[PDB]
Amino acid sequence: AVRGFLIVGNKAFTQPFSLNDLPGAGRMDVLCRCTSQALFISHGIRRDVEVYLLLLGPPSPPKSILIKGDEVRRMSPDERNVAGHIKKALAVECGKSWKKVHSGVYVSRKGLEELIEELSEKYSIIYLKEDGVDISNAQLPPNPLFVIGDHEGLTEEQEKVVERYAALKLSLSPLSLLAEQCVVIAHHHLDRLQF
Amino acid sequence: AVRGFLIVGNKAFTQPFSLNDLPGAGRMDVLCRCTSQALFISHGIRRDVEVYLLLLGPPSPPKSILIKGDEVRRMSPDERNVAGHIKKALAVECGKSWKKVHSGVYVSRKGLEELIEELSEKYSIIYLKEDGVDISNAQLPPNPLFVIGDHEGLTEEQEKVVERYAALKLSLSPLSLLAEQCVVIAHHHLDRLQF
């Protein structure tokens, strides 16, 4: 059983930015919170988790970041710490394939379609949206990857791409929630089944 | 129907602090994350929510902060923004009575005993802890206040204070979660009943 998350940051900056203004770097703060809630519990990191971030803001999009839970060595749940990792990744020259930035953090210039095609080899892709099938009326696959939009949500064209690969489109709440809330609630559903 | 959260920051600083190091201000970042997750959803602020933060760290404890979802303006879900509200509150001279800092944000020198006593007039107090009964084995009231410990949890003495007033002690997950994850899951339980 592995668990994955893909968070799509349409405005998120694609070069180093100020750690003192996360919302100013194309709402990088959203991506920080999703990463933190995907990885951390009280005793430490979920070692079966991977977090994939797609950053489509200026000035050099696309960039993708992979944070591998079983490989991270120095990370804490606060936004500034997570942003420091992202900032380092955005400084690195890279191509189409994953390039290691430091322990458990990789970067590449993969866009949405390349990334979703690759992930579908490892994960069953689940698109989380408010109007999906209720998650409790659904049978979850063993290796879910949850695709989640940012503070604005996926664009129409991006949804068409995701839905080409998505095994399920699922709702987790009667309300429209923050991206990182969907992360927490997804993990909760899975923890109930597992533990 | 109203919803309340009391987050107990046993180490959290009680005077203005540096905004670049939220964990270093006695795990102030935990308090910021819980406040954000208590208040925000994708459309904005939940107007039936109050967040109470109890800060017991140096140099001048106790101090407590009330943020009223129905009144607060100019708040955003990122930690640094919430930190900025707290830092303003921590600068205000106050006594035991709630003193207004700015719209929807009040500060006082109430400790745990005083807060619990006051809160018990408006809310049914629920203590969230990993070893309580599962939230599914309980009927929640229409006016829950959820008491949640910080990074390290409530002391035996503080638990004694809370149990004098608490209706229920409930677990919401088979794992030990971050404090703000408890906030999200508590909201999710209530949302599913309400909406």
Q: Is B193 in the A-facing interface, judged by CB distances under 8 Å? A: no
Encoded tokens for B98: 């709630």
Burial of B97 per CB tally in 10 Å (0-12, 13-18, 19+): exposed
CA-to-CA separations, B89 to B22, B29, B92, B106, in angstroms, rounded: 15, 16, 6, 7
For domain A1-195, give the fold: Alpha/beta knot (3.40.1280)
Please choose, from the candidates A78, A6, A184, the residue with its C-alpha nearest in 3D space to the C-alpha of residue B175: A184
The token pair that represents A125 in the structure block: 């892709």
Please confirm whether the linkage preceding B142 is cis (ω < 30° from 0): no
What technique was this entry resolved by? X-ray
A20, A41, A181 ranked by CB distance to B175: nearest: A41
Give CA–CA dist A128/A134, Å, rounded: 10
CA distances (Å), B114 to each of B28, B34, B95, B110, B165, in order?
22, 21, 12, 6, 12
Asked if B29 lies within 8 A of A195 by C-beta distance, the reply is no
E strand map for chain B? 3-9, 40-41, 44-45, 49-55, 63-68, 99-102, 105-108, 124-134, 144-149, 168-171
Is some CB atom of chain B closer than 8 A to the CB atom of A77?
yes
The Cα A128–Cα B180 span in angstroms is 21
- Asked if B11 and B28 count as a contact pair (C-beta separation under 8 A), the reply is no
* CB proximity list for A42: less than 8 A, separation 6 or greater: B151, B175, B176, B177, B178
User: Could you tell me which chain A residue has the CA closest to the CA of B150?
Assistant: A42
The answer on whether B26 is annotated among ligand-binding residues is no
A70 token code pair: 């079983």
Reported as type and span, the H/E element at residue A6 is strand A3-9
Alpha helix (H) residue ranges in chain B: 28-39, 79-90, 112-119, 156-163, 179-194
Resolution (Å) of this entry = 1.9
Closest CA to A33 of A65, A91, A80, A71: A80
- Residue B26 corresponds to which tokens in the numbers above? 């006695």
